[PDB]
Amino acid sequence: HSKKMEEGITVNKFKPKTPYVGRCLLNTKITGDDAPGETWHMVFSHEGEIPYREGQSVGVIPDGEDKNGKPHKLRLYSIASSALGDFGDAKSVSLCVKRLIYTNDAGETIKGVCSNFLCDLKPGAEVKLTGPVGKEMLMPKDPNATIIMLGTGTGIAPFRSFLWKMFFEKHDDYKFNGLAWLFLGVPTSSSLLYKEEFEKMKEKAPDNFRLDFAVSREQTNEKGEKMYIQTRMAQYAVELWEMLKKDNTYFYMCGLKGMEKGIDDIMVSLAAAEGIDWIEYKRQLKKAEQWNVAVY
Numbered sequence: 001h002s003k004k005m006e007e008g009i010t011v012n013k014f015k016p017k018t019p020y021v022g023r024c025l026l027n028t029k030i031t032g033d034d035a036p037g038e039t040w041h042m043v044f045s046h047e048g049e050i051p052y053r054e055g056q057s058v059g060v061i062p063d064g065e066d067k068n069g070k071p072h073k074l075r076l077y078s079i080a081s082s083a084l085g086d087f088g089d090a091k092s093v094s095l096c097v098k099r100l101i102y103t104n105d106a107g108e109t110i111k112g113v114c115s116n117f118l119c120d121l122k123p124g125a126e127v128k129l130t131g132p133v134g135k136e137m138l139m140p141k142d143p144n145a146t147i148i149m150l151g152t153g154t155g156i157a158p159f160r161s162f163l164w165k166m167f168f169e170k171h172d173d174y175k176f177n178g179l180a181w182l183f184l185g186v187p188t189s190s191s192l193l194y195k196e197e198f199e200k201m202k203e204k205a206p207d208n209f210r211l212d213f214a215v216s217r218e219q220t221n222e223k224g225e226k227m228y229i230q231t232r233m234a235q236y237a238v239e240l241w242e243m244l245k246k247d248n249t250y251f252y253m254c255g256l257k258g259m260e261k262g263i264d265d266i267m268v269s270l271a272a273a274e275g276i277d278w279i280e281y282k283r284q285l286k287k288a289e290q291w292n293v294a295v296y
């Protein structure tokens with residue numbers, strides 16, 4: 001029995017040994033120059049060969065071989081477009097990718113393999129894709145569900161997928177009528193991803209969509225604390241905690257592994273205040289399919 005849209009999903013139609021080869025249509029840098037690090041939105045053609053659903057991921061096998069002459073390991077990217085896609089025809093797939101650049105022990109600059117390959121793609125270049133992968137981040141079946149979404153950085157990707165479906169499309173069997181609430185935590189204003197799209201959805205369904213941004217390096221709460229995502233949530237603590245108590249509420253979290261801890265800290269306190277052990281409560285939520293997490 002699922003509370004999620006699991007029926008008839010496709011998983012691993014394409015595999016590492018037999019990937020689907022698509023072509024890049026567009027590749028755009030979507031963060032401003034200020035932004036610490038670039039993030040690119042890219043669209044690939046798949047001609048309807050990859051029957052994905054909102055919340056799933058695709059694997060990307062970057063070109064080249066590892067130090068042993070073997071093909072690079074695949075990396076997973078949450079799909080950032082809804083099932084019909086950015087063009088409404090179910091033939092393209094979009095990804096949201098941050099370019100990874102760090103320094104090794106010797107002070108030498110290392111670029112992540114897959115992220116730099118993807119961000120460097122030019123229209124017309126081919127790309128090896130696997131999947132779809134995943135069941136954890138699918139949408140609830142309930143069209144009247146209260147859906148709370150908390151992403152950091154690229155974790156915004158599956159929520160864009162959800163929201164395009166909910167608010168930018170007409171479906172014969174699905175009309176969203178609940179409350180969708182998005183919190184997005186980034187470091188700078190030049191790093192707010194898809195703000196413009198979310199701003200248009202808000203105007204469209206003002207009673208069905210709430211939006212909150214947390215720009216850490218540019219916002220502080222009263223104590224003077226940095227505006228991290230949990231720092232922004234705490235401000236709605238009483239409201240969110242009350243929302244968590246209802247059977248039709250669904251929590252999804254996606255982004256950097258770090259975020260998990262700072263929300264747990266906020267939650268352990270709200271629950272204890274009511275005589276509840278957060279660890280056991282979160283466990284029950286996870287089992288009821290209401291606390292969904294994908295951090296990396």
Ligand SMILES: Cc1cc2nc3c(=O)[nH]c(=O)nc-3n(C[C@H](O)[C@H](O)[C@H](O)COP(=O)(O)OP(=O)(O)OC[C@H]3O[C@@H](n4cnc5c(N)ncnc54)[C@H](O)[C@@H]3O)c2cc1C
Nearest residue numbers: 075076077078096097098100102112113114115154157296
């Ligand atoms: C379910 C899922 C969905 C994902 N969705 C997305 C998405 O939508 N967008 C996205 O950008 N990524 C996403 N990722 C992450 C993505 O899969 C890649 O890991 C990421 O793009 C970097 O891979 P790479 O090949 O560029 O790096 P690699 O070449 O594999 O390099 C990674 C390695 O770099 C090292 N490293 C990183 N930072 C440092 C540092 N500061 N100092 C030292 N060593 C360091 C780590 O040891 C790590 O093993 C997702 C991951 C998962 C599991």
